[PDB]
Symmetry: D2
């Protein structure tokens, strides 16, 4: 039992924080105002190491474990206000780079993986459908086996990075009779006949992180573009959501650390009634709640990632971390706004935008109600 970072871990965090502050955060307000996702900046960040994660040196990575990857992303969330860009990068890493690395064939990794790792190609993961969100293994898209490969049809929605992606990791039923065990995963390229990527659909939360729908009309998928084995798509999707929960969520821990620093500074500076507003217990009690949340959920995340790195069963720990971080990020966003009063309603300060950016953390990679179903199953309450 130990709560210090190794020198190696500290260096990873500090180097990422410096990049996030000095490269990504510079000029972020202009990009955020204009709803710009800078693909040139995105590619620099990817190549710096944010698209690497556990990927081996053979494909351009540094073979980080889950805790190291989480530290890097925590630093990114603390260091850069441009959380839409950070979310876009972490989605590419966790839902696309990592499943290709972990399950792709030698031939598929050789063709595509280093390009994803260095950010030469942007990827999007397409699983959700209009009738399959929480009930994801009810997806209706079909990849019907044929000579040479598969015929793919269906519609995917809410796809992060679809308007900017070069390749798509897509999940579809190769055996529509089944649920989880009837799903396969495939890699398809932008431009393939029958792939119709929709125009970006605007949103107020994560507003510069583009998403859209994609429609498959009789796409031919060559056999070699299946990722992993036939019918293993459910297991692949599952494994990628573990990395998305476990490591992508670190982004919101680092955002909460930055939020707490800003809020503490204001509560010491702002005077009313002849003293700093932090001297009133109504004010200081809320800030203490923010601090208690940050310390608790960061330890939960660190232990979940550490257990993964030890080869222990970390599924319940990662669901617990994702649930706590996202709830705490939203509640603390509200508490920061309440500390600032009327001065919160100020687009240069970013507190309201911060709350908007935290709202979807309770939804993606599985809603918090679904995390509770996962935890309930691990506790033996779904027997």
């Amino acid at each position: 039992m130990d709560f210090n970072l190794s020198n190696s871990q500290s260096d990873i965090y500090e180097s990422a924080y410096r990049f996030a502050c000095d490269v990504l955060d510079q000029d972020a307000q202009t990009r955020i105002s204009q709803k710009i996702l800078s693909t040139e900046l995105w590619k620099k960040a990817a190549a710096y190491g944010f698209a690497h994660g556990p990927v081996s040196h053979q494909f351009g990575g540094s073979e980080l474990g889950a805790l190291d990857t989480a530290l890097m992303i925590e630093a990114l969330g603390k260091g850069s206000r441009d959380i839409g860009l950070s979310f876009s990068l972490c989605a590419h890493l966790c839902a696309c780079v990592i499943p290709l690395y972990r399950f792709g064939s030698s031939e598929l990794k050789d063709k595509y993986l280093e390009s994803l790792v260095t950010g030469k190609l942007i990827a999007a993961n397409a699983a959700t459908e209009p009738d399959a969100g929480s009930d994801i293994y009810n997806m209706q898209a079909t990849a019907q086996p044929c000579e040479g490969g598969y015929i793919l049809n269906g519609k995917k929605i809410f796809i992060t990075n679809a308007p900017i992606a070069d390749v798509f990791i897509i999940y579809a039923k190769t055996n529509p009779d089944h649920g989880f065990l009837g799903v396969s995963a495939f890699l398809i390229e932008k431009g393939t006949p029958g792939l119709n990527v929709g125009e970006v659909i605007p949103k107020d939360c994560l507003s510069n992180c583009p998403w859209s729908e994609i429609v498959f009309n009789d796409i031919f998928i060559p056999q070699s573009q299946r990722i992993g084995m036939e019918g293993a798509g459910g297991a692949i999707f599952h494994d990628s959501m573990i990395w998305a929960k476990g490591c992508l969520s670190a982004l919101f821990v680092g955002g909460l650390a930055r939020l707490l620093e800003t809020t503490l500074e204001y509560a010491k500076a702002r005077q009313q009634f002849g003293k700093a507003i932090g001297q009133f217990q109504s004010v200081s009690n809320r800030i203490i709640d923010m601090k208690l949340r940050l310390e608790q959920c960061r330890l939960m995340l660190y232990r979940a990632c550490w257990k993964h790195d030890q080869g222990q069963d970390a599924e319940a720990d990662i669901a617990m971390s994702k649930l706590l971080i996202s709830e705490y990020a939203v509640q603390s966003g509200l508490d920061a706004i309440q500390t600032f009063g009327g001065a919160a309603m100020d687009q240069e300060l970013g507190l309201v935008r911060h709350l908007l950016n935290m709202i979807p953390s309770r939804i993606f990679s599985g809603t918090n109600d679904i995390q509770k179903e996962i935890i309930a199953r691990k506790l033996g309450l779904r027997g």
Copy 2:
């Protein structure tokens, strides 16, 4: 003890709801998208009766009590998505029309009040300053008595409607030695030498309701433009915040009623796992929380307004209502978003914008921490 509306009260509600639905709500999405506050629509709403409140027939009003006024505004909040416009109207009514009616001289009412009541003139109330928000009686603006009137200097911030107002109800120290008892209230016109109204300052919450700062540089205020007696400004401001709490807050009750109807409809329609998502207790428990909040806070508001109409001391009841409504409006906005999942991130649906619009309800007319100070004082805990 009775919980039915009179036929008169029912008619007031239904007529206001019809206007809000058929006149203000029509085309609201376009105006909201473009951040437009339609002054022509605003003036129609004012003249319909939303700028009238308790004002007598002599000045164009219908002599509504507080409960009737609250019913009208509840209907407005349920019937129109354009809550920025509604907030702008209710600010003009509660913080400007009502103090002029209740404290203005015959000569000042004769000159200005009917024009405010019919919406021919838009008004803004200017009390808050950079160093006087919660500690409002620390305001530093000064109205130095001189022959003929006063010389006014100072700066006001966060002023709803300032960029569109024709007249300003302003609070300033006529005796800078004192706090509450050193404040007077004045009416000044747009265009007066020395009045510098700032350009609209954008915000994401209530985004089409314009506000800005105003600066006074050696403005001469003629004696006849003082509202009420010298040194009575604190009492006037206080009384106007009672109407702003007590009746303007009704807007958010009606918004919560509309939100609950939308959320219940979705939870019955949306299927996952072979059933309506409202069949899962995680989902239905949150919707029940929304329903419990709405029923409780609407009764608190109705009783506070009814006690006012009976001539009872309603100050603590109005502070309790404002506190509960605003907290419940924010929490229920979050609960609706969580019910919809990814479909909440949809600008046409308006759920995220609804939450943005509710966030400032915990701040204006006194933050919720200040409401608790008021309640604590009434309970004898500030002795």
Copy 3:
């Protein structure tokens, strides 16, 4: 819309409060210390009017509506610390007197009802079983029709007043094929062959209110002792739980009013750091939460009872009231204890005993999770 009591309602409340203070509360600490339920005091309270409720003058009652009955019981809960005795009386009234009055035949009312109304006979209601608590219509006790009546077998548990009751209102399956529609209700007397009433089972909550199990071994029930029609037991039980929710819960509103008065007094009297502890916002914020809870849930209860008296559908309103009152009573018990600090751990003060007494309010007459199921059904979420 009106929030004043009629003179008649005020008199009912004040007379009950005086009785509770001057008759039941006198000497209560000694009885509570010794875990005594004074049947002589119980009978005086019953005859004063607490066992009357809606019962007509023909049987000794005053034909109170639900709101009047709730006012009487609110006064009882504020006026007497002996909540175990009050709970025992209200259980007899709501679960036994009222179903006999509302559904019993002329012959059964003539024989028993006035004796229950004046407290000459104590009654207990026996529905719950080891395998039928929330799922009450899964009860397995059977009343097999035969010549002359029924043969009753089974076991009931958690029966308030069973060790002191003279008669028992019991629910059993006359058609074991069905659930709700297979239940009938019966009145049986202490002493009947085959009735085995268990010895009192001690508890720390409501510790002087006796309960035990009862076992039926081939009891013969004469036909004339069935209450209402065959198979109508589910509807009778349902209707009695409405009165138990709706009116018995008033007891905990009056207890919260007494608790708040005690807590406010202490927070003004107790000094630390040179001032009253109520001057610290951590302390006053919790007391304000107690006050907000009491005002909200009392209005919900009053409206639920008023709607019942108007002949409106009040089922959802009564479930909402029972849910809020019991949750708020428990949370406010904890908040009072926290206000007192170490002085809460004092058996003469009664704050810890008060919390114990509130804990079962979330369980009896249907748990709060079951109230949410009822509300969810009324909202259309169980379709």
Copy 4:
């Protein structure tokens, strides 16, 4: 960063758990029913190692760090239902053994410390007074320096173990002009002229852990019985409350672990509506809250104790741990009761008694409002 116990730490935990289960828990229900604190059992536990903590081998201890001590006490709280006895032992260890070891002279340790470490002598710590609870450095007891020592007068209240103690560690003003810097600490023996120990004062929480008041009437304290330097009593008391927070609180973590195991077992076993009650999300969501609380607060405690062992500043971490553990212990006690329904009201099961035993965790060693003041000071909000 590591979350495994060393083999040494695991052995400490398992050995303590075995003792708590096989020695202290055996027959605990009878002792709890009779409100017995078994001094023979207490002394066996003390000598086994629960009265040792950081004390060196020279005085009979094993020189445990804070994390090891916390592990031992966590095991005690999980293994034995007799939390009153455990609390009594940990109070003796943290508030009496440890300050004597850390600040006592060679002569005072030589005379008394090994006897306290082996439990031959029971000790009580007496700081709180009628007018000095949270404001502890306002204590009014006086130890007036004289030739040879001090004349002690005053009254202490809420003193754990006073009715059974052989020695008393007492705090009094040697310079009544000052607060914190005017306090000294002394060791006095039962039986000294002028010491009047009150009879046990009963309580429902921790009901077999005896406490009473003590009154000093012109006690002569010999110079050699002062603990540490003159005027250092505030620092000594402060340091002992760190151990009381940081390590004694571990008791309630182990109690929550035992509670969660019992609650999970019941939610899988108890059927209603044809399934285990844990299958309903209302039930499983509450149990998940218990699990999330236990994992978070146990990590906070482990890190606080680990930081102490590393020589880092752990004051804020220990205040955060004490605050979270005690709040979570109370809330989870309520959640367990709600899981069991009517079966919670069963003295053999102990769930209601468990909640009673957790209620004082939010009060002793400084209330949770005072922990928030400590955290606020460490955050720079009390500047």
